[PDB]
Design a protein around this nucleic acid. Structure first.
Ligand SMILES: [Zn+2]
Ligand SMILES: [Zn+2]
Ligand SMILES: [Zn+2]
Ligand SMILES: [Zn+2]
Ligand SMILES: [Zn+2]
Ligand SMILES: [Zn+2]
Ligand SMILES: [Zn+2]
Ligand SMILES: [Zn+2]
Ligand SMILES: [Zn+2]
Ligand SMILES: [Zn+2]
Ligand SMILES: [Zn+2]
Ligand SMILES: [Zn+2]
Lengths: 51, 46, 51, 47
DNA sequence: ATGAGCGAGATGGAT
DNA sequence: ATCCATCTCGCTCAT
């Protein structure tokens, strides 16, 4: 299985209220968390709580 | 089959020659249509 | 009035291409200007020169 | 002068106060426009 | 009159 | 720093 694709959202100045919570974030889009990512001001709600 | 109303109500070059004309869109002529200043390139069949 | 604008007309996959840069939504055509410096595709702007 | 239709999908703080409003972009007021929730600061002079 | 569909522009993750 | 796929949202025009 390919390595978990890390994101870099919000690094640059963009709208900080949606960083990693829209379809441009590959993690958010794939229902993953940003564990291990290099995003800044991450607003990803996903926890990978697969239970 | 459609009878369009293009040009009745501006880009005069595209009248019945763009996706919003139901006849152009469907590869049809404007035979029987109510269009004004029709530019449909598909002529009524002789 | 500012220096003439730059457009990006025609980048979408539209088949409505007869009037690319030759209708009111092109800021160049609308202002009686050429597409000098633009990144439009399939440009039909009839203006060869600015102003 | 143009007649814009801004405000008639989201973000109303900036309607007619951003580069996509032909009036704001050209330093014109929205007097006579069809815009709605207009935030254009430019005011039309007195005739 | 009017609103669906259009399409040029803004955005910002990736580079 | 720009680039371009994706999204926004002002504009046109058949209805
Ligand atoms: Zn992200
Ligand atoms: Zn991430
Ligand atoms: Zn994140
Ligand atoms: Zn027609
Ligand atoms: Zn027709
Ligand atoms: Zn016709
Ligand atoms: Zn153009
Ligand atoms: Zn141009
Ligand atoms: Zn052009
Ligand atoms: Zn406006
Ligand atoms: Zn206005
Ligand atoms: Zn306004």
């Amino acid at each position: 299985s390919p390595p978990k694709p890390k994101c870099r959202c919000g690094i640059s100045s963009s709208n900080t209220l949606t960083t990693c919570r829209n379809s441009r974030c590959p993690c958010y889009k794939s229902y993953n968390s940003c564990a291990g990512c290099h995003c800044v001001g991450c607003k990803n709600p996903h926890k990978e709580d697969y239970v």
